[PDB]
Design an enzyme around this catalytic site. Structure first.
Site, PDB file in Angstrom:
ATOM      1  N   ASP A  11     -44.179 -44.038  -0.165  1.00 36.35           N
ATOM      2  CA  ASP A  11     -42.928 -43.497   0.446  1.00 36.35           C
ATOM      3  C   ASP A  11     -42.597 -42.100  -0.094  1.00 36.35           C
ATOM      4  OD1 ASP A  11     -42.327 -45.899   1.983  1.00 36.35           O
ATOM      5  OD2 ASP A  11     -41.805 -46.811   0.026  1.00 36.35           O
TER       6      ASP A  11
ATOM      7  N   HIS B  90     -46.962 -23.728   0.923  1.00 33.34           N
ATOM      8  CA  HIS B  90     -47.696 -24.981   0.777  1.00 33.34           C
ATOM      9  C   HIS B  90     -47.491 -25.941   1.935  1.00 33.34           C
ATOM     10  CE1 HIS B  90     -43.939 -25.324  -1.366  1.00 33.34           C
ATOM     11  NE2 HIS B  90     -43.948 -26.589  -1.008  1.00 33.34           N
TER      12      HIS B  90
ATOM     13  N   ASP C   5     -45.138 -26.718   4.240  1.00 32.32           N
ATOM     14  CA  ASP C   5     -43.930 -27.299   4.779  1.00 32.32           C
ATOM     15  C   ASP C   5     -42.890 -26.288   5.275  1.00 32.32           C
ATOM     16  OD1 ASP C   5     -42.745 -26.465   2.413  1.00 32.32           O
ATOM     17  OD2 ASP C   5     -42.241 -28.527   1.639  1.00 32.32           O
TER      18      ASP C   5
ATOM     19  N   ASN D 261     -39.061 -19.059 -12.079  1.00 32.93           N
ATOM     20  CA  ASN D 261     -37.601 -19.192 -12.020  1.00 32.93           C
ATOM     21  C   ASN D 261     -37.113 -19.332 -10.561  1.00 32.93           C
ATOM     22  OD1 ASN D 261     -38.088 -16.882 -14.484  1.00 32.93           O
ATOM     23  ND2 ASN D 261     -37.288 -18.906 -14.941  1.00 32.93           N
TER      24      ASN D 261
ATOM     25  N   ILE E 242     -36.114 -21.031  -7.312  1.00 36.17           N
ATOM     26  CA  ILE E 242     -36.362 -22.420  -6.858  1.00 36.17           C
ATOM     27  C   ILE E 242     -37.324 -23.185  -7.823  1.00 36.17           C
ATOM     28  CG2 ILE E 242     -37.363 -23.822  -5.147  1.00 36.17           C
ATOM     29  CD1 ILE E 242     -36.676 -21.209  -3.218  1.00 36.17           C
TER      30      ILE E 242
ATOM     31  N   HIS F 201     -38.128 -28.707  -4.737  1.00 35.31           N
ATOM     32  CA  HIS F 201     -37.287 -29.185  -3.597  1.00 35.31           C
ATOM     33  C   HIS F 201     -37.721 -30.600  -3.180  1.00 35.31           C
ATOM     34  CE1 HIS F 201     -40.098 -26.577  -0.809  1.00 35.31           C
ATOM     35  NE2 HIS F 201     -40.593 -27.805  -0.912  1.00 35.31           N
TER      36      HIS F 201
ATOM     37  N   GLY G 280     -40.485 -37.181   4.812  1.00 34.66           N
ATOM     38  CA  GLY G 280     -39.245 -37.852   4.288  1.00 34.66           C
ATOM     39  C   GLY G 280     -39.448 -38.281   2.815  1.00 34.66           C
TER      40      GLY G 280
ATOM     41  N   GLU H 202     -43.753 -22.566 -12.477  1.00 36.90           N
ATOM     42  CA  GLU H 202     -42.880 -22.771 -13.626  1.00 36.90           C
ATOM     43  C   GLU H 202     -43.596 -23.086 -14.973  1.00 36.90           C
ATOM     44  OE1 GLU H 202     -40.286 -21.425 -12.972  1.00 36.90           O
ATOM     45  OE2 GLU H 202     -40.014 -21.728 -10.850  1.00 36.90           O
TER      46      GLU H 202
ATOM     47  N   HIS I  63     -31.940 -36.171  -4.191  1.00 33.31           N
ATOM     48  CA  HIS I  63     -32.208 -35.688  -2.852  1.00 33.31           C
ATOM     49  C   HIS I  63     -33.153 -36.654  -2.077  1.00 33.31           C
ATOM     50  CE1 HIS I  63     -30.069 -31.947  -3.226  1.00 33.31           C
ATOM     51  NE2 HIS I  63     -30.860 -31.433  -4.157  1.00 33.31           N
TER      52      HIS I  63
ATOM     53  N   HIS J 292     -25.690 -32.214  -3.025  1.00 35.21           N
ATOM     54  CA  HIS J 292     -25.160 -31.650  -4.247  1.00 35.21           C
ATOM     55  C   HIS J 292     -23.697 -32.122  -4.502  1.00 35.21           C
ATOM     56  CE1 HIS J 292     -28.390 -28.367  -3.745  1.00 35.21           C
ATOM     57  NE2 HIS J 292     -28.733 -29.135  -4.772  1.00 35.21           N
TER      58      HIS J 292
HETATM   59  C1  LIG Z   1     -29.023 -32.188 -16.653  1.00 35.75           C
HETATM   60  C2  LIG Z   1     -29.058 -31.607 -15.252  1.00 35.75           C
HETATM   61  C3  LIG Z   1     -27.990 -31.499 -14.367  1.00 35.75           C
HETATM   62  C4  LIG Z   1     -28.386 -30.848 -13.134  1.00 35.75           C
HETATM   63  C5  LIG Z   1     -29.763 -30.470 -13.163  1.00 35.75           C
HETATM   64  C6  LIG Z   1     -30.566 -29.790 -12.073  1.00 35.75           C
HETATM   65  C7  LIG Z   1     -29.878 -29.068 -11.006  1.00 35.75           C
HETATM   66  C8  LIG Z   1     -30.590 -28.463 -10.003  1.00 35.75           C
HETATM   67  C9  LIG Z   1     -32.079 -28.504 -10.030  1.00 35.75           C
HETATM   68  C10 LIG Z   1     -32.867 -27.796  -8.952  1.00 35.75           C
HETATM   69  C11 LIG Z   1     -32.590 -26.276  -8.950  1.00 35.75           C
HETATM   70  C12 LIG Z   1     -33.344 -25.670  -7.786  1.00 35.75           C
HETATM   71  O1  LIG Z   1     -34.542 -25.531  -7.834  1.00 35.75           O
HETATM   72  N1  LIG Z   1     -32.625 -25.335  -6.551  1.00 35.75           N
HETATM   73  C13 LIG Z   1     -33.279 -24.780  -5.365  1.00 35.75           C
HETATM   74  C14 LIG Z   1     -32.943 -25.643  -4.141  1.00 35.75           C
HETATM   75  C15 LIG Z   1     -33.606 -26.993  -4.324  1.00 35.75           C
HETATM   76  C16 LIG Z   1     -32.731 -28.093  -4.811  1.00 35.75           C
HETATM   77  O2  LIG Z   1     -31.464 -28.015  -4.722  1.00 35.75           O
HETATM   78  O3  LIG Z   1     -33.245 -29.132  -5.335  1.00 35.75           O
HETATM   79  C17 LIG Z   1     -32.803 -23.341  -5.215  1.00 35.75           C
HETATM   80  N2  LIG Z   1     -32.639 -22.558  -6.249  1.00 35.75           N
HETATM   81  O4  LIG Z   1     -32.549 -22.890  -4.121  1.00 35.75           O
HETATM   82  C18 LIG Z   1     -32.755 -29.148 -11.052  1.00 35.75           C
HETATM   83  C19 LIG Z   1     -31.953 -29.808 -12.141  1.00 35.75           C
HETATM   84  S1  LIG Z   1     -30.536 -30.935 -14.665  1.00 35.75           S
HETATM   85 CA   LIG Z   2     -39.719 -20.818  -8.606  1.00 42.29          CA
HETATM   86 CA   LIG Z   3     -42.650 -39.637   2.422  1.00 44.91          CA
HETATM   87 ZN   LIG Z   4     -42.468 -28.131  -0.319  1.00 46.00          ZN
HETATM   88 ZN   LIG Z   5     -30.673 -29.859  -5.501  1.00 45.55          ZN
END
Ligand SMILES: Cc1ccc(-c2ccc(CCC(=O)N[C@@H](CCC(=O)O)C(N)=O)cc2)s1
Ligand SMILES: [Ca+2]
Ligand SMILES: [Ca+2]
Ligand SMILES: [Zn+2]
Ligand SMILES: [Zn+2]
Length: 159
Positions: A54, A64, A66, A74, A76, A79, A88, A97, A118, A124
């Site tokens: 799943d 890549h 999608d 740094n 993104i 996702h 899905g 990273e 997600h 969020h």
């Molecule tokens: C202890 C924690 C509390 C919150 C945590 C967190 C918060 C956010 C992230 C992802 C941060 C990130 O990669 N955001 C993409 C969108 C993708 C997405 O929203 O997943 C962007 N910058 O546009 C990873 C970790 S870790």
């Molecule tokens: Ca990145």
């Molecule tokens: Ca899937």
């Molecule tokens: Zn992707």
């Molecule tokens: Zn997020």
């Protein structure tokens, strides 16, 4: 649209690894990240090493396949797609990273845990203490438990 999984036992597959961590550290990070959501819901996560899970987990660079490319170091970090067939639920991690299991940017377990929210249908939160807060910051992981705002979110969907 309130998209959610219609089964409680979900499967996942780790398709590739990042070079910066052992396979067992990657495996451990993913397993713990699913466990944070499991201890707070009816969901049960089961690993497969191949075939059609799943939730596929993969590390990719830039374009890549999608239509949401990654962006180099740094920005993104990762996702993930909302529950549903096909792509899905899947979660992609930016191979460019630094991936760690320490306080140094970026803790793979913390980022996976967020991404799996997600993957299970959460959006969020505006709560600056929540896992599902839009921005990453390190918090003590050695027995990290879901913040109450994220417990509320997963319970609101799945009981
Ligand atoms: C202890 C924690 C509390 C919150 C945590 C967190 C918060 C956010 C992230 C992802 C941060 C990130 O990669 N955001 C993409 C969108 C993708 C997405 O929203 O997943 C962007 N910058 O546009 C990873 C970790 S870790
Ligand atoms: Ca990145
Ligand atoms: Ca899937
Ligand atoms: Zn992707
Ligand atoms: Zn997020």
């Amino acid at each position: 649209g309130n998209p959610k999984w219609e089964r409680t036992n979900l499967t996942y597959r780790i398709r590739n690894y990042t070079p910066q961590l052992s396979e067992a550290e990657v495996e451990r990070a993913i397993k713990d990240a699913f466990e944070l959501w499991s201890v707070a819901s009816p969901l049960i996560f089961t690993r497969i090493s191949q075939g059609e899970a799943d939730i596929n987990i993969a590390f990719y660079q830039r374009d890549h396949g999608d239509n949401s490319p990654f962006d180099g170091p740094n920005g993104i970090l990762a996702h993930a797609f909302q529950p549903g067939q096909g792509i899905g639920g899947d979660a992609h991690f930016d191979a460019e990273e630094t991936w760690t299991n320490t306080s140094a940017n970026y803790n793979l377990f913390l980022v996976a845990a967020h991404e799996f929210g997600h993957s299970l249908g959460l959006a969020h939160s505006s709560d600056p203490g929540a896992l599902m807060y839009p921005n990453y910051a390190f918090r003590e992981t050695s027995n990290y438990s879901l913040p109450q705002d994220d417990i509320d979110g997963i319970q609101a969907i799945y009981g």
